[PDB]
Amino acid sequence: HWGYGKHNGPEHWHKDFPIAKGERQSPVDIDTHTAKYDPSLKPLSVSYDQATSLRILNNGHAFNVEFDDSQDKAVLKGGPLDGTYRLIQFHFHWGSLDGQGSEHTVDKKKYAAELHLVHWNTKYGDFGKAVQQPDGLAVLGIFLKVGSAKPGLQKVVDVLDSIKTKGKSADFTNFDPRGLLPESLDYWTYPGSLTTPPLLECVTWIVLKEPISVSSEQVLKFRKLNFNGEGEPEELMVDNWRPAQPLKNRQIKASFK
Ligand SMILES: [Zn+2]
Fold first, then answer.
1. How many angstroms is it from 53 CA to the middle of ligand 1?
2. Catalytically annotated residue among 14, 61, 104, 119
3. Where is the site labelled Involved in the binding of some activators, including histamine and L-histidine?
4. What spacing in Å lies between the alpha carbon of 62 and ligand 1's midpoint?
């Protein structure tokens, strides 16, 4: 029964998931004045030309857009990674107000929201096996600021009314995640964790430096979702972000000078 409230939010998660106080927790603050440029880092390869979305789902904590990951179709490679990671889903974290919502922060700056594109290492065969490995997942994180609309987001925005409450899902085919990417693939990278329970330390994080812009109208539609199920007291799905966790014995490495 974890969530984002007073009584079940991030500060409580350690009770059911003790790794919440582990050595490689996410998100973190990205200090741009101490992250070092790493010339050994490679350009990120994002190959989403054959990505096939299936469906969108409200899970009571965010919504997930899902992909058919049965074929080698939508993959992330290069960057800091060895081998090939397959896209399984994306989701967002966002705020009640534009001044908060991101999980990672940049010199303590909070963005209005953050997109996570989740990929599993094909060497482990499926997602469930991958999350048991320190190099099992690669998550591409992209900041959202409020300004111009993102045309490529509008298809997601316009299905949310059909998945208002926890447990509702809808068919969601042919969505192109390339429409959610900024121009630059410059990134920061570090080893960390899932940012929701079970908080497993299985993620190579790749956080893009350039945010995308979405409109106030687009974010407002996110904020009309509900954490609760149909026929339960209404609690708006807002502030579904975990705050920055201690960096501990990690370095954040920059792909760019
Ligand atoms: Zn996430």
1. 18
2. 61
3. 89
4. 9
Q: How far apart are CA 25 and CA 246, in angstroms?
A: 7
- Span from the CA of 22 to the centroid of ligand 1 (angstroms): 18
Please state, in angstroms and rounded to a whole number, the distance separating the CA atoms of residues 113 and 209: 14
7 is catalytic: no
In the chain, the number of structural domains is 1
Domain of residue 144, residue span: 1-257
Technique used to solve these coordinates: X-ray
* Alpha carbon 216 to chain centroid, angstroms: 20
What resolution in angstroms does the PDB record give? 1.1
